[PDB]
Design a protein around this ligand. Structure first.
Ligand SMILES: NC(=O)c1ccc[n+]([C@@H]2O[C@H](COP(=O)([O-])OP(=O)(O)OC[C@H]3O[C@@H](n4cnc5c(N)ncnc54)[C@H](O)[C@@H]3O)[C@@H](O)[C@H]2O)c1
Ligand SMILES: NC(=O)c1ccc[n+]([C@@H]2O[C@H](COP(=O)([O-])OP(=O)(O)OC[C@H]3O[C@@H](n4cnc5c(N)ncnc54)[C@H](O)[C@@H]3O)[C@@H](O)[C@H]2O)c1
Ligand SMILES: NC(=O)c1ccc[n+]([C@@H]2O[C@H](COP(=O)([O-])OP(=O)(O)OC[C@H]3O[C@@H](n4cnc5c(N)ncnc54)[C@H](O)[C@@H]3O)[C@@H](O)[C@H]2O)c1
Ligand SMILES: NC(=O)c1ccc[n+]([C@@H]2O[C@H](COP(=O)([O-])OP(=O)(O)OC[C@H]3O[C@@H](n4cnc5c(N)ncnc54)[C@H](O)[C@@H]3O)[C@@H](O)[C@H]2O)c1
Ligand SMILES: NC(=O)c1ccc[n+]([C@@H]2O[C@H](COP(=O)([O-])OP(=O)(O)OC[C@H]3O[C@@H](n4cnc5c(N)ncnc54)[C@H](O)[C@@H]3O)[C@@H](O)[C@H]2O)c1
Lengths: 368, 337, 337, 368
């Protein structure tokens, strides 16, 4: 229903049709993506992932910029600038930021006016302005058609958060710090390649870099009532795709065991935190969750407490797959969040309605 | 002593630099670099290596404008213009453009066109560059030759003894392949690479491809063309690669006979250039070692005495530099142009 | 219906297990299996795989003695001696020995001793077995071989096409090599193993070696021996591997000439067995894939119409099992015993 | 000074052997190992390492029992049971428990039996008597020839202790944990194959092994002053031989930054932890920790605190090489901590030590 597309083409640009096409409830539909590499690539790209396997889908090569997806077609863009991208002509209600360079809704805005009704932010954008959008926490608490460029915090936190959310929610926690296992990726070069950062410079899949996580702050960004109580380090580690943190947390509460909280997990995971929060029982590893979309994988057993209160709290998780499911999260939400129907103002009383047309009304020059 | 700059300066250049230092009496006074990267980085680029570990040499930068290595001041320019890089403030003798993007003489000339005077590249010089490799073409290289290049490490590495290959027995046909490592040139993570193979992430997948080894083979040795031509395999490894070649030699023989015929090669020519043995060694047991490879004399098996296996963990990285650093010294030597 | 237990519940154990679920029409009533490893481990091990992922097949079992999965409740014990491994308690139909440690017919005898009826070995049995392999030794195969073997995936995969090539074009000489993965056959660490190379860790190092391929080719192909000889290259990968062979074929031909020929074969017979294409696909593109290997069409060069490189990503583990599964059910059929 | 053997050819045995031959002034001298694998193999193995490469010193293979360590003719055995292997015939002062097989001192007792006058345990504790001994921590606290079957725990503890010990000593540890991604080894499975720990039963450098480690609490076994404050799991992962932990525990003192404590750690790393720790502010990764002579190494730059109390201790270490020095650290300490046949203070002459040395009776040594 909702007109969708992707800014650029990434592995997350590779991520979601796997979900989306594999999805069964997606109202919206992508119709185009900026693969500046050709469908042949894009297909070979999208049809064949590196981790989740070949796309189990007849995503086929109709015309070099308009291919097929098991019969459903989708156009392709090939460019690295919003302004030429005719999201207007494309009518795209919702586009996914795939440059990263848009750490700013502004640059994403360069598509909004270009006919992006709304813009799917994907990563932690250095532009703070956008309300910090995270499922289980603030997902609904987002305001539809209010600054339609829609944030999406780091999977690491974005997965950690609902869990990280439930804990203090279950407990109340003085504060917290942690370290995930940031899988090896491209951002850190396979080679010791010239980098704006010493860390991701190095040859990737051998060295293991601890690094910066505003995602830690992003907790406060999504858990304002939990502001400041957050910390941790971004340990870039050599895996294909799974990260997992144990979170050091001085729990504000008594200091009862975790299994209780894990029962509360077993409550809340089975509660709203389905889809994201799993507490499996068999102690299992990265593979055991690949292609599995339970966007958080806690181990009750492995998780421990120190003083009963300082809880050593772990959770396996992928870094893009679950993240790719965060796509659908607001997607179907923002879809129903989309008005569709009309408004009930009074262009006499709410002459702003009349002014929405008659914007050059002295009757309307508010704050200006 | 030879004022040198390095464009696209990288690992192999860093290697060349770790070579340069290891090259005690390095007649290349490489006081200049081109590298768009940051200095401390560029330091760590040389300072902190993965494969050979950090550069066993401390790096000091005063304060950010210049960095001095082993008590010698060094510079690193950074501008994507193939000329603006000031190779003239010194009037650079030798330039090494790592980027390889100027497979045409031009960019290298463009490097020469503001002070630089000589060139070698990791990229095989397509056409307008002498097919110049140690063991094979560094000699016929007259120092008047200014802008040359090296072809693939593979090409670079195989060159000397594969020349010696057809020497001792003659080769009916030859189809070579490498256990080429993984690099960032192939998409280390899935990105827009022309080669769909080299396009994925594939930290554990191989890349069918070919190389100037399949091409300069003629350019380095005339008959060695087509029948003497193979492919390349970029494999999930970081390090010293191996030659996956079976030479259909002309003269009937058995394996060690050719290895006997190639003991001498190390004993006379491959010395420093290449090596050979049969003690089982692996890429790390080839690390930072300048003899471009050791041939698996044992498993370089003979089959029909014509189609003969050739197998050698070859230094795709360090010897590659070394050989070029050797070639650099060669051009550091005979200095007229 | 085939009351079967396999020895050595390795990956291939899980594979065929998964294949049991994967392959349809399984008379292979393999209600038992052997691996001296812990069974509940093995269960979870069966339950949880890395490559083809956990075998999501939920299994409910009451008591250590009885285990049930996907309806087909399946026993399994852990022991070394096939005589200490009772088979007559089920009157075992077939065994395959994934351990490899029973690489002679006696263990099968010892398996036949405790009440087994038929045996085959995925691994090439040392000595006292005429192996059976589809495409090569499944035609003259007799179900009346209570003890037989398969060869390594390498042979188990490299066989048919080149035989058919030998059928359709012949080969003067063949130089076969693989990208043979790593396994328990080699030491994770540099642990003490007979083969120094297999002893080493080699997390990123290959093993220059030779599996039974260039040897089992003798059995499976009474023609192609000596002339048609290469070696193995046991690589530091866990997964689907690639063939790497250059042949000196007999009849004059060129690349595509064999391809459609190689195509048509799979278009009828190597269907399921093997494959061929030229769409660049990397390892990940071959998870749980059964057509043992698609051969590259481009890089499969042809020199002098005899010197012909060949290349194909092959499933050393699952497609091997597939092939292992292939005749396995066949001997279940024609169930003379 | 001290003829030394090992429980088989431990990997770290080879590691320390590389050290041993390159070791400065080892009073002790290893002259035999157990290779039930062929000397040439073990030699090659000893010669050719993967991690630090082959030896830059040609050990030469004299006979299948005794090769020559660049001339130094060192023997070997071929077994896993000492009781038939008389280090007595070898006069081996100390056999080293390079495996863990005889996880029990009594198991190692078979070797004091088999001709050892002392024994070094390359293992954390299993029973009680374990001579829990961390150089820097409690090195000097060894009673001369007290419990000749002497214990060196894994760096998981061995490296782990001193700064931690120092940390409380410097800042006051209340309760908490560290955790490292630990290297891959054979103690975890190559691939998915038989092992009790499902985790250590899998393919490791392609996964993570979040698993219990009493070492995380065995620090009390050398720092009992800090008993009850300890937790932590390791994570065997794609690293050859290196790790780095972060003891994030609520600290007793104020809650100031770490760097300050790390400035004193900069003192301590040069102080009691000289040749042991290294507070290297340069953000450096595993490769930058090869040949980790220093038993530990710290990055203050990233070392920090969340609420001050918990300490984001950024500090690294090799897991075997450094340990292979802790081998010598303890060992040549014990060389001092055990004057062997060099007995310049006999007292077994006109003083009662004679009969004890001679033979116990209702005599000089008519003990309890
Ligand atoms: N997955 C996470 O949790 C997370 C968090 C923060 C940031 N990120 C980054 O944001 C991106 C999202 O992941 P991904 O699956 O898309 O992998 P990805 O790295 O392939 O996505 C971005 C890539 O798309 C391409 N790109 C950028 N702009 C483009 C344009 N105009 N046209 C065509 N291509 C363009 C580039 O290759 C870029 O590297 C990644 O760069 C990821 O590294 C991811
Ligand atoms: N002067 C200021 O600092 C400032 C700045 C921002 C807003 N405002 C408030 O908002 C309005 C803008 O103020 P201003 O400083 O720009 O002076 P202004 O009010 O003169 O700017 C608007 C002028 O442009 C024309 N105009 C109005 N709407 C137009 C439209 N759609 N298209 C073309 N022309 C249009 C009119 O001639 C008008 O005089 C004012 O009503 C003011 O009250 C003032
Ligand atoms: N080592 C080999 O065997 C081999 C063989 C053939 C080609 N190559 C190429 O050479 C590189 C490896 O050599 P290396 O270890 O010295 O490192 P390197 O990667 O830094 O050398 C070349 C690099 O220069 C970079 N570049 C482009 N413009 C640049 C600029 N203004 N300034 C600085 N760099 C710029 C390119 O990205 C290129 O990858 C790889 O890029 C590889 O693709 C290597
Ligand atoms: N293509 C080849 O080269 C080839 C062919 C056949 C077998 N093999 C070997 O056999 C295995 C085949 O692949 P896989 O997925 O099954 O891996 P795998 O190693 O897990 O299979 C071997 C299994 O046998 C078990 N084992 C060892 N000794 C045993 C004994 N006395 N009794 C019962 N079980 C015993 C092992 O624990 C293991 O589970 C590999 O270990 C491989 O090394 C290799
Ligand atoms: N890497 C270290 O610093 C270290 C030190 C002590 C213990 N450990 C742990 O315990 C194991 C041993 O330590 P390592 O580092 O030397 O690796 P390792 O496993 O290679 O050391 C044991 C080696 O000695 C031999 N061995 C094993 N058991 C034996 C026995 N009963 N008798 C004779 N020889 C035997 C084998 O060759 C084995 O490789 C390791 O697997 C590791 O998990 C590690």
């Amino acid at each position: 229903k909702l007109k969708v597309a992707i800014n650029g083409f990434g592995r997350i640009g590779r991520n979601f049709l796997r979900c989306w096409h594999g999805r069964k409830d997606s109202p919206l539909d992508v119709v185009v993506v900026n693969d500046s590499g050709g469908v042949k690539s894009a297909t070979h790209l999208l049809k064949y992932d590196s981790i989740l396997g070949t796309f189990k889908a007849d995503v086929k090569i109709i015309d070099n910029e308009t291919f097929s997806i098991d019969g459903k077609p989708i156009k392709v863009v090939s460019n690295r600038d919003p302004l030429k991208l005719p999201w207007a002509e494309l009518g795209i209600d919702i586009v996914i930021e795939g440059t990263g360079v848009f750490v700013d809704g502004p640059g994403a805005g360069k598509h909004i006016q270009a006919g992006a009704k709304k813009v799917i932010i994907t990563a932690p954008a250095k532009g703070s302005d956008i309300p910090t959008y995270v499922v289980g926490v603030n997902e609904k608490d987002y305001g539809h058609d209010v600054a339609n460029i829609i944030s999406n915090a780091s999977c690491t936190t974005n997965c950690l958060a609902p869990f990280v959310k439930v804990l203090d929610e279950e407990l109340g926690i003085v504060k917290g710090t942690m370290t995930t296992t940031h899988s090896y990726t491209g951002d850190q070069r396979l080679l010791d390649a010239s980098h704006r950062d010493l860390r991701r410079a190095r040859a990737a899949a051998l060295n293991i870099v601890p690094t910066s996580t505003g995602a830690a702050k992003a907790v406060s960004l999504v858990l304002p009532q939990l502001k400041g109580k957050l910390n941790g380090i971004a340990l870039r580690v050599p895996t294909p795709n799974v990260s997992v943190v144990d979170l050091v947390v001085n729990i504000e509460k008594v200091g009862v065991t975790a299994e209780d909280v894990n029962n509360a997990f077993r409550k809340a995971a089975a509660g709203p935190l389905k889809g994201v929060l799993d507490v499996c029982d068999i102690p299992l590893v990265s593979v055991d969750f690949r292609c599995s979309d339970f966007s958080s994988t806690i181990d009750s057993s492995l998780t421990m407490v120190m003083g009963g209160d300082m809880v050593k709290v772990v959770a396996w998780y992928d870094n893009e797959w679950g993240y790719s499911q965060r796509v659908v999260d607001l997607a179907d939400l923002v879809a129903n969040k989309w008005p569709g129907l009309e408004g009930s103002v009074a262009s006499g009383d709410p002459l702003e309605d009349f002014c929405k047309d008659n914007p050059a009304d002295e009757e309307c020059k508010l704050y200006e | 002593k030879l004022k040198v700059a390095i464009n696209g300066f990288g690992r192999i250049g860093r290697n060349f630099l770790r070579c340069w230092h290891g090259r005690k009496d390095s007649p290349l006074d490489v006081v200049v670099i081109n590298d768009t990267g940051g200095v401390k980085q560029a330091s760590h680029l040389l300072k902190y290596d993965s494969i050979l570990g950090t550069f066993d040499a401390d790096v000091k930068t005063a304060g950010d404008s210049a960095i001095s290595v082993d008590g010698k001041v060094i510079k690193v320019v950074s501008d994507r213009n193939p000329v603006n890089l000031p190779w003239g403030d010194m009037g650079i003798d030798l330039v090494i453009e790592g980027t390889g993007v100027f497979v045409d003489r031009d960019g290298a000339g463009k490097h020469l066109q503001a002070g630089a005077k000589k060139v070698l590249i990791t990229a095989p010089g397509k056409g307008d560059i002498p097919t110049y490799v140690v063991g094979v073409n560094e000699e016929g290289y007259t120092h008047a030759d200014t802008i040359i290049s090296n072809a693939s490490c593979t090409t670079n590495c195989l060159a000397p003894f594969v020349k010696v290959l057809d020497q001792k027995f003659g080769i009916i046909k030859g189809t070579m392949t490498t256990t080429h490592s993984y690099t960032g040139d192939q998409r280390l993570l899935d990105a827009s690479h022309r080669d769909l193979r080299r396009a994925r992430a594939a930290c554990l997948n191989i890349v069918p491809t070919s190389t100037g080894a399949a091409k300069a083979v003629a350019l380095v040795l005339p008959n060695l063309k087509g029948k003497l031509n193979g492919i390349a395999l970029r494999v999930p490894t970081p390090n010293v690669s191996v030659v996956d070649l079976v030479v259909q030699v002309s003269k009937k023989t058995f394996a060690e006979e050719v290895n006997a015929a190639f003991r001498e090669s190390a004993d006379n020519e491959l010395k420093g250039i290449l090596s050979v043995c049969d003690e089982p060694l692996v890429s790390i047991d080839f690390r930072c070692t300048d003899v471009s490879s050791t041939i698996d004399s044992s498993l370089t098996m003979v089959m029909g005495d014509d189609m003969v296996k050739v197998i050698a963990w070859y230094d795709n990285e360090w010897g590659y530099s070394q050989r070029v650093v050797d070639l650099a010294d060669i051009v550091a030597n005979k200095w007229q142009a």
